[PDB]
Design a binder for these strands. Sequence first.
DNA 1: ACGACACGCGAAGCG
DNA 2: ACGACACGCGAAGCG
Lengths: 95, 95
Amino acid sequence: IAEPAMIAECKTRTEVFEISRRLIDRTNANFLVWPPCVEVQRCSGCCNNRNVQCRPTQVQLRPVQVRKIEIVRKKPIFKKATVTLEDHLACKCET
Amino acid sequence: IAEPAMIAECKTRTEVFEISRRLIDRTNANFLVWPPCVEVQRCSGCCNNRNVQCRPTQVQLRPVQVRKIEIVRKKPIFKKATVTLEDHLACKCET
DNA sequence: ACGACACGCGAAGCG
DNA sequence: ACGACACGCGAAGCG
Ligand SMILES: [Mg+2]
Ligand SMILES: [Mg+2]
Ligand code: NA
Ligand code: NA
């Protein structure tokens, strides 16, 4: 049996977000962070036509604590950093 | 409160797949298809290090019936086409 | 490829 | 930036 294809509608789905070291610290390179990636909610899917794109209508800022190791003369200094994630809460087909 | 960040592990998640008109018919252009996009399952996420990538271990072929209109001298001929989707069923960090 | 259907919505049917 | 911890796993603690 071949089922009718169903449209991937415009809505929030779980996507993989890579945590940017650049945003943790832009002025020093001597560090590691964990974890490297987290789940976020993002608007995806396809609208009726190509005059409209699937865009977020409301977004939820979400801070998360990542583990950080600064390497100083080959020894680790343990720190914590806060990364502010953005979740999409709702989407509509737009413009 | 800032919760500990949790790793987006290597596993299957729902992704948006655009249905390729090219695969429906490579030798004629005078047609439309519906729907334009469907949900599929795909391996995503991040492994421990960069010597390994998150790859599928088993995949499930899934045929779906899409609606097709061939436009012939400005009139529509209704047809059905079968698109074979590929779902990822399982993933592991690899190579 | 230039936004049928008594209409509006979706070789459709219902109201 | 060159794959601590009595070890192995994960300024850790448990077995
Ligand atoms: Mg009637
Ligand atoms: Mg001990
Ligand atoms: Na009609
Ligand atoms: Na230890």
